[PDB]
């Protein structure tokens, strides 16, 4: 009776932003990004990508509550580079990795199949 | 169709309830056909 329909785990309602930017009060150059309708699948990859940024002082993420289809990513960067632009870059390059991998798996298969 | 029980019950009842042995045999002939009939 109280099962939320499974689509509520990923479908955004009217007005819900897929991502929400919030400033951190405890430290400078730090934000908490709240992704709605998401889980660990998208969060850990972004976290790991942020760990590659030399201008990221702190980066990690949580799903405030597993029964809540919402996650909280915290980013903290150097004074010359905001956590927001860090997030921008951490999206910009993670997509790049997956796109290049798509091309390499596609060619490795076409070379494997009838070749 | 589900009356196999009805025919079986009718044949079974007649054999003890009827003093003639012929009725049980006549029902037995129907009973053998009943395996396919149901």
């Amino acid at each position: 009776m109280n099962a939320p329909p499974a689509f509520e785990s990923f479908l955004l309602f009217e007005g819900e932003k897929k991502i929400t930017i919030n400033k951190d009060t405890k430290v400078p150059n730090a934000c908490l990004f709240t992704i709605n309708k998401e889980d660990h699948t998208l969060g850990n990859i972004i976290k790991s990508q942020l760990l590659k940024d030399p201008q990221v002082l702190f980066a990690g993420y949580k799903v405030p509550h597993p029964l809540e289809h919402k996650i909280i990513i915290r980013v903290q960067t150097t004074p010359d580079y905001s956590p927001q632009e860090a997030f921008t870059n951490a999206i910009t390059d993670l997509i790049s990795e997956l796109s290049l991998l798509e091309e390499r798996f596609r060619v490795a298969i076409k070379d494997k199949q009838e070749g | 169709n589900y009356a196999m029980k009805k025919t079986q019950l009718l044949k079974e009842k007649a054999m003890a309830e009827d003093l003639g042995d012929q009725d049980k045999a006549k029902q037995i002939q129907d009973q053998l056909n009943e395996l396919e009939e149901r």
Partner: protein, 481 residues
């Protein structure tokens, strides 16, 4: 009324039961050699508890006929098989001698609450409160004695990949994480049927009860309900979706006419499966209506294992989130390790391993208690043959990160049961429901839409709190002003 049991007769330190009997009996499928011949021949005897005090009883002839230093030398009987001391619910338990007996008692009790196919004509019956599992299974680890319960043919449970790990903290204090994706696949899914009996009748000379689609222009007592759902007969049609307080049978009693109809019970939300109409003993129209309900196992539903591990579905995680082994094997259920050391249900561990061996071996394992020919070392030997850790632990990779979890998790097929205690049958909330007409206090019980009793021990707790305004509010302003 004398309770007795059959026992092997022992005249010398040698059996009365020789190979000729056994040779005849292995062929019992063709020839009917049986107990009658065995007792008539004077090989077996029925000892009663009162008679069991003057008999000297061996446990097995294959060992109690040899000697090192004579212990008895005067046996009179020998146990046929000691595992036969267990009962019906107690005989499904694998490795019961490897569990702390109170846990066994709890499983024995829990074997009575496990959902399953209770009878082959369950689809014919218009009986009240029926539950049948979608896919109950023959246990992978069986006692050779559960074949006689015909549990192989009438199982109540599923061989499930149980992971004994406190995972993500929700698999905690008897609660257990469940595999959401498996549930999608119908894992432990069951259907629940409720049956409604209804008969029209002669209320009296002025009034007589009759099934009819009531209409406002003539029927009194009508409510906001959808009578449109009953067909002109005045009865709901099979295959029509119903919900709490929906009208099921348009019974009407003439005055203009009073609506005495039957509506679906409080909080039910079911679908009419089939509608049977007939005449009762008295020849009045009488009908039984059966409403089916598919019960997807959700969070809070109570599960038990064959070892006394009562536990609620703590949370459900998708297969992507469940931990996985070196291969794509995720546990179906994650149980808390702290539930084991305290309960010492080693039979559970041995079951989870023999089920593992049974699924790898591809044969139904034997978990008869006093086996003596199947022990953990032998089982480990069997498992060690399949390229698996001989003790069953595995390197689980975190479902969230994929990182191996530093501890290799004990994981394997274990026969779990789904108990009837689904949470939706218990969840209850109130705000001005009916009142008992005598003491004008909220009614009692969830069917009557009652209110929770704020007992004396709860009051006393408030007394100790000194929250006198709350105590007064609960006992007056929020109860019966």
């Amino acid at each position: 009324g004398r309770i007795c049991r059959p026992l092997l007769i022992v005249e010398k330190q040698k059996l009365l039961l020789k190979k000729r009997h056994i040779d005849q009996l292995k062929e019992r499928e063709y020839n009917n050699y049986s107990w009658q011949d065995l007792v008539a021949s004077g090989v077996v005897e029925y000892i009663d508890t009162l008679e069991e005090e003057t008999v000297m009883l061996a446990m097995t002839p294959d060992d109690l006929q040899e000697k090192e230093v004579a212990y008895c030398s005067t046996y009179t009987h020998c146990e046929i098989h000691p595992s036969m001391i267990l009962g019906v619910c107690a005989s499904i338990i694998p490795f019961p001698d490897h569990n702390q007996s109170p846990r066994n008692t709890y499983q024995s009790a829990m074997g009575k609450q496990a959902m399953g196919v209770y009878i082959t004509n369950f689809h014919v019956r218009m009986d009240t409160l029926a539950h049948v599992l979608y896919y109950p299974q023959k246990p992978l680890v069986t006692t050779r004695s559960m074949e006689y319960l015909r549990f192989r043919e009438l199982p109540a449970g599923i061989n499930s990949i149980v992971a004994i790990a406190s995972y993500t903290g929700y698999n905690q204090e008897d609660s257990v994480i469940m595999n959401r994706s498996a549930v999608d696949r119908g894992f432990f899914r069951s259907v629940f049927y409720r049956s409604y009996k209804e008969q029209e009748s002669k209320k009296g000379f002025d009034q007589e009860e009759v099934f009819e689609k009531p209409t406002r222009e003539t029927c009194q007592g009508m409510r906001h309900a959808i009578y449109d759902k009953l067909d002109d007969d005045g009865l709901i049609a099979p295959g029509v979706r119903v919900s709490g307080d929906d009208v099921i049978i348009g019974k009407t009693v003439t005055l203009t006419k009073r609506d005495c109809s039957t509506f679906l019970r409080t909080s039910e939300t079911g679908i009419v499966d089939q509608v049977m109409v007939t005449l009762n003993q008295e020849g009045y129209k009488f009908c039984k209506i059966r409403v089916r309900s598919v019960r997807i196992p959700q969070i809070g539903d109570k599960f038990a294992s064959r070892h006394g591990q009562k536990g609620t579905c703590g949370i459900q995680y998708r297969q992507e989130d469940m931990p996985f082994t070196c291969e794509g094997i995720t546990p179906d259920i994650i149980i808390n390790p702290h539930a084991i050391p305290s309960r010492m249900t080693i039979g559970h561990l041995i079951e989870c391993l023999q089920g593992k061996v049974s699924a790898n071996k591809g044969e139904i394992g034997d978990a008869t208690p006093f086996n003596d020919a199947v022990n953990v070392q032998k089982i480990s030997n069997l498992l060690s043959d399949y390229g698996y850790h001989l003790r069953g632990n595995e390197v689980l990779y975190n479902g969230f990160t994929g990182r191996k979890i530093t501890s290799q998790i004990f994981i394997g097929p274990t026969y779990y049961q789904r108990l009837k205690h689904m949470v939706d049958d218990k969840i209850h909330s109130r705000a001005r429901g009916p009142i008992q007409i005598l003491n004008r206090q909220p009614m009692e019980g969830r069917s009557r839409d009652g209110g929770l009793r704020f007992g004396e021990m709860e009051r006393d707790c408030q007394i100790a709190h000194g929250a006198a305004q709350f105590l007064r509010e609960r006992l007056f302003e929020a109860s019966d002003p």
